[PDB]
Write a protein that holds these residues in place. Structure first.
Motif, PDB file in Angstrom:
ATOM      1  N   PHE B  81      11.075  22.940 -95.821  1.00 32.23           N
ATOM      2  CA  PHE B  81      10.125  21.922 -95.523  1.00 32.23           C
ATOM      3  C   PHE B  81       9.219  21.629 -96.797  1.00 32.23           C
ATOM      4  O   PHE B  81       9.219  22.545 -97.524  1.00 32.23           O
ATOM      5  CB  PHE B  81       9.238  22.388 -94.553  1.00 32.23           C
ATOM      6  CG  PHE B  81       9.815  22.740 -93.274  1.00 32.23           C
ATOM      7  CD1 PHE B  81      10.413  21.749 -92.409  1.00 32.23           C
ATOM      8  CD2 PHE B  81      10.063  23.970 -92.643  1.00 32.23           C
ATOM      9  CE1 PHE B  81      11.271  22.073 -90.971  1.00 32.23           C
ATOM     10  CE2 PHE B  81      10.594  24.356 -91.601  1.00 32.23           C
ATOM     11  CZ  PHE B  81      11.114  23.427 -90.725  1.00 32.23           C
ATOM     12  N   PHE B  82       8.921  20.395 -96.950  1.00 23.43           N
ATOM     13  CA  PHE B  82       8.175  19.964 -98.133  1.00 23.43           C
ATOM     14  C   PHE B  82       7.190  19.094 -97.717  1.00 23.43           C
ATOM     15  O   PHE B  82       7.089  18.310 -96.946  1.00 23.43           O
ATOM     16  CB  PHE B  82       9.306  19.080 -98.972  1.00 23.43           C
ATOM     17  CG  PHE B  82      10.282  19.850 -99.417  1.00 23.43           C
ATOM     18  CD1 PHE B  82      11.691  19.676 -98.881  1.00 23.43           C
ATOM     19  CD2 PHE B  82      10.353  20.609-100.578  1.00 23.43           C
ATOM     20  CE1 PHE B  82      12.707  20.369 -99.115  1.00 23.43           C
ATOM     21  CE2 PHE B  82      11.547  21.076-101.194  1.00 23.43           C
ATOM     22  CZ  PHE B  82      12.605  21.217-100.119  1.00 23.43           C
ATOM     23  N   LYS B  83       5.961  19.189 -98.770  1.00 22.34           N
ATOM     24  CA  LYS B  83       4.831  18.302 -98.598  1.00 22.34           C
ATOM     25  C   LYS B  83       4.352  18.033-100.151  1.00 22.34           C
ATOM     26  O   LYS B  83       4.336  18.811-100.800  1.00 22.34           O
ATOM     27  CB  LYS B  83       3.699  18.746 -97.655  1.00 22.34           C
ATOM     28  CG  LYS B  83       2.554  17.800 -97.318  1.00 22.34           C
ATOM     29  CD  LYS B  83       1.961  17.803 -96.360  1.00 22.34           C
ATOM     30  CE  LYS B  83       1.087  16.551 -96.076  1.00 22.34           C
ATOM     31  NZ  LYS B  83       0.789  16.324 -94.526  1.00 22.34           N
ATOM     32  N   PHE B 108       2.061  32.499 -96.223  1.00 22.00           N
ATOM     33  CA  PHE B 108       3.422  32.963 -95.283  1.00 22.00           C
ATOM     34  C   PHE B 108       2.818  33.078 -93.981  1.00 22.00           C
ATOM     35  O   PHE B 108       1.799  32.870 -93.568  1.00 22.00           O
ATOM     36  CB  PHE B 108       3.861  34.454 -95.609  1.00 22.00           C
ATOM     37  CG  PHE B 108       2.685  35.590 -95.123  1.00 22.00           C
ATOM     38  CD1 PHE B 108       1.757  35.896 -95.712  1.00 22.00           C
ATOM     39  CD2 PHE B 108       3.421  36.304 -93.956  1.00 22.00           C
ATOM     40  CE1 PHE B 108       0.720  37.005 -94.789  1.00 22.00           C
ATOM     41  CE2 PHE B 108       2.812  37.321 -93.524  1.00 22.00           C
ATOM     42  CZ  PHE B 108       1.545  37.667 -93.880  1.00 22.00           C
ATOM     43  N   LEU B 110       4.538  34.940 -90.451  1.00 27.18           N
ATOM     44  CA  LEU B 110       5.336  36.000 -89.969  1.00 27.18           C
ATOM     45  C   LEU B 110       5.641  35.937 -88.497  1.00 27.18           C
ATOM     46  O   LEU B 110       4.739  35.555 -87.703  1.00 27.18           O
ATOM     47  CB  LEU B 110       4.985  37.551 -90.322  1.00 27.18           C
ATOM     48  CG  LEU B 110       6.097  38.456 -89.997  1.00 27.18           C
ATOM     49  CD1 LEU B 110       5.776  39.689 -90.779  1.00 27.18           C
ATOM     50  CD2 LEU B 110       5.313  39.348 -88.494  1.00 27.18           C
ATOM     51  N   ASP B 128       1.363  36.556 -87.646  1.00 23.44           N
ATOM     52  CA  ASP B 128       0.313  36.139 -88.722  1.00 23.44           C
ATOM     53  C   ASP B 128       0.812  35.009 -89.374  1.00 23.44           C
ATOM     54  O   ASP B 128       1.786  34.609 -89.878  1.00 23.44           O
ATOM     55  CB  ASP B 128       0.260  37.438 -89.484  1.00 23.44           C
ATOM     56  CG  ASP B 128      -0.251  38.454 -89.158  1.00 23.44           C
ATOM     57  OD1 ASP B 128      -1.381  38.409 -88.817  1.00 23.44           O
ATOM     58  OD2 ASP B 128       0.511  39.709 -89.400  1.00 23.44           O
ATOM     59  N   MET B 143       0.274  23.812 -91.691  1.00 25.74           N
ATOM     60  CA  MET B 143       1.582  23.379 -92.419  1.00 25.74           C
ATOM     61  C   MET B 143       2.744  24.611 -91.723  1.00 25.74           C
ATOM     62  O   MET B 143       3.515  24.164 -91.415  1.00 25.74           O
ATOM     63  CB  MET B 143       1.593  23.249 -93.942  1.00 25.74           C
ATOM     64  CG  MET B 143       2.865  22.606 -94.407  1.00 25.74           C
ATOM     65  SD  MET B 143       3.230  22.367 -95.983  1.00 25.74           S
ATOM     66  CE  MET B 143       4.933  21.883 -96.231  1.00 25.74           C
ATOM     67  N   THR B 146       3.300  24.407 -88.214  1.00 27.42           N
ATOM     68  CA  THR B 146       4.033  23.257 -87.991  1.00 27.42           C
ATOM     69  C   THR B 146       5.595  23.585 -88.356  1.00 27.42           C
ATOM     70  O   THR B 146       6.357  23.062 -87.671  1.00 27.42           O
ATOM     71  CB  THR B 146       3.670  22.052 -88.576  1.00 27.42           C
ATOM     72  OG1 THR B 146       2.245  21.673 -88.097  1.00 27.42           O
ATOM     73  CG2 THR B 146       4.544  20.701 -88.584  1.00 27.42           C
ATOM     74  N   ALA B 149       7.073  25.535 -85.593  1.00 29.25           N
ATOM     75  CA  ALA B 149       7.411  24.639 -84.470  1.00 29.25           C
ATOM     76  C   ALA B 149       8.527  23.694 -84.621  1.00 29.25           C
ATOM     77  O   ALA B 149       9.213  23.498 -83.755  1.00 29.25           O
ATOM     78  CB  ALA B 149       6.024  23.908 -84.005  1.00 29.25           C
ATOM     79  N   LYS B 150       8.590  23.223 -85.798  1.00 28.14           N
ATOM     80  CA  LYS B 150       9.542  22.338 -85.996  1.00 28.14           C
ATOM     81  C   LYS B 150      10.977  23.002 -85.888  1.00 28.14           C
ATOM     82  O   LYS B 150      12.106  22.596 -85.531  1.00 28.14           O
ATOM     83  CB  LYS B 150       9.541  21.726 -87.560  1.00 28.14           C
ATOM     84  CG  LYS B 150       8.649  20.417 -87.327  1.00 28.14           C
ATOM     85  CD  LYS B 150       8.543  19.901 -88.681  1.00 28.14           C
ATOM     86  CE  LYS B 150       9.634  19.104 -89.222  1.00 28.14           C
ATOM     87  NZ  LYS B 150       9.904  17.873 -87.998  1.00 28.14           N
ATOM     88  N   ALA B 152      11.537  25.747 -84.157  1.00 26.45           N
ATOM     89  CA  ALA B 152      11.820  25.873 -82.807  1.00 26.45           C
ATOM     90  C   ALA B 152      12.560  24.727 -82.295  1.00 26.45           C
ATOM     91  O   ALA B 152      13.473  25.106 -81.439  1.00 26.45           O
ATOM     92  CB  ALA B 152      10.541  26.415 -82.116  1.00 26.45           C
ATOM     93  N   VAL B 153      12.326  23.710 -82.548  1.00 25.39           N
ATOM     94  CA  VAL B 153      12.746  22.406 -81.887  1.00 25.39           C
ATOM     95  C   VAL B 153      14.012  22.080 -82.356  1.00 25.39           C
ATOM     96  O   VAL B 153      15.079  21.973 -81.940  1.00 25.39           O
ATOM     97  CB  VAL B 153      11.946  21.032 -82.320  1.00 25.39           C
ATOM     98  CG1 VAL B 153      12.655  19.936 -81.779  1.00 25.39           C
ATOM     99  CG2 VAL B 153      10.635  21.247 -81.614  1.00 25.39           C
ATOM    100  N   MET B 178      -2.900  19.698 -80.623  1.00 23.05           N
ATOM    101  CA  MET B 178      -1.489  19.743 -80.718  1.00 23.05           C
ATOM    102  C   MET B 178      -0.640  19.767 -79.599  1.00 23.05           C
ATOM    103  O   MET B 178       0.507  19.625 -79.556  1.00 23.05           O
ATOM    104  CB  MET B 178      -1.046  20.994 -81.606  1.00 23.05           C
ATOM    105  CG  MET B 178      -1.669  21.173 -82.919  1.00 23.05           C
ATOM    106  SD  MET B 178      -0.984  22.899 -83.543  1.00 23.05           S
ATOM    107  CE  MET B 178      -0.227  23.340 -82.156  1.00 23.05           C
TER     108      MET B 178
END
Lengths: 204, 204
Positions: B81-83, B108, B110, B128, B143, B146, B149-150, B152-153, B178
């Protein structure tokens, strides 16, 4: 005498795990939440070795003694747990892993490893314990919890954790008698359903 | 411009995970709880593939663009993932996975799989999240959440869960925005230390 044994579940136990989860949902009046399938359990619960990820201990009962060992156990770190106890089970035929042998599955505990960053040590989290109705009121729920704790000690794991209902005063006192501590400051947060699926749209 | 990337940790990242956990303990004034070692992390965090058990996403930052991919990623189910964000880091040399490249580890998360019996579906539990001090107040904690969560989807997992302090009103409101739900009825129970070790004596 009724003999009991707690062993590791393997893929052939999926029908019994499925039916135990269903009976747990029926017991709780939560069957509207039940969408588990045998295929779903078979493809998700056994992708790792025991204690590596999701792990199920099965409680079995018999009117005759169990073997002293299980030589085909799916983990080298596990030997079964046993107890002798001083009953009508119409569902026996749906819970017998070997149809000809006088042994039936009576309950389960599902657990998986958690982790303490500060200790660099895994522990276990217990998600569900369920004992089916003919074997209720005999202490088997406590026996299954004890089995997970004993396994944690044998493996050098750091902690065993679970949740309890705030109003379940008798269980809270039971857990405190065992030496467990109820951490009053934490609340569980859950992201699921369409709220979770919406994260698909986040641009990262 | 500051570029950021979230990738999977691998065994070579153990020194950075160790130091991030230590800085988290220092930040919380909980260093009396810190007994983590590099050997302990190395022998416990990487016994399974990513998402199979304990998993760590690492946040890294750079003044120059990151590569678009990681071809050696330890999971086929993961792309980074990037931002892009519109800073003095004295500890940079202790957080650079390649000493010659202008990239440093900044934080990080975990996490590890949990399970819903009623769904026969795994989910993720986040244990954590920590962002080190020069990169704080920039939204990187969100981030990292997120990112889990992403993931998991992408994997079809059922839920993402974590805990929050009862008094952390701002985080609670953030989680509700959220779409997460705070489950007010549950309390966490923990069995550890000599209380856990005493289960060695139970005759099962």
């Amino acid at each position: 005498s009724m003999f009991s044994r707690i062993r590791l579940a393997t893929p052939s136990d999926v029908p019994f795990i499925h039916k135990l989860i269903h009976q747990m949902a029926v017991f709780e009046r939560l069957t509207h939440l039940f969408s588990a399938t045998e295929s779903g359990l078979a493809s998700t619960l056994f992708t790792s070795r025991p204690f590596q990820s999701f792990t199920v201990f099965l409680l079995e009962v018999s009117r005759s003694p169990f073997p002293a060992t299980i030589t085909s156990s799916p983990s080298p770190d596990f030997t079964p747990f046993f107890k002798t106890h001083n009953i009508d089970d119409p569902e026996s035929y749906n819970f017998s892993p070997d149809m000809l042998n006088d042994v039936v599955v009576a309950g389960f505990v599902l657990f998986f490893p958690n982790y303490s960053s500060f200790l660099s040590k895994p522990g276990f989290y217990i998600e569900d314990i369920f004992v089916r109705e003919p074997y209720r009121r005999k202490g088997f729920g406590s026996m299954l919890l004890t089995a997970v704790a004993k396994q944690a000690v044998k493996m050098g794991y750091g902690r065993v954790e679970w949740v309890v209902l705030d109003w379940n005063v008798n269980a809270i006192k039971f857990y405190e008698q065992m030496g467990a501590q109820i951490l009053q400051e934490w609340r569980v947060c859950r992201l699921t359903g369409d709220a979770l699926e919406a994260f698909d749209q986040v641009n990262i």
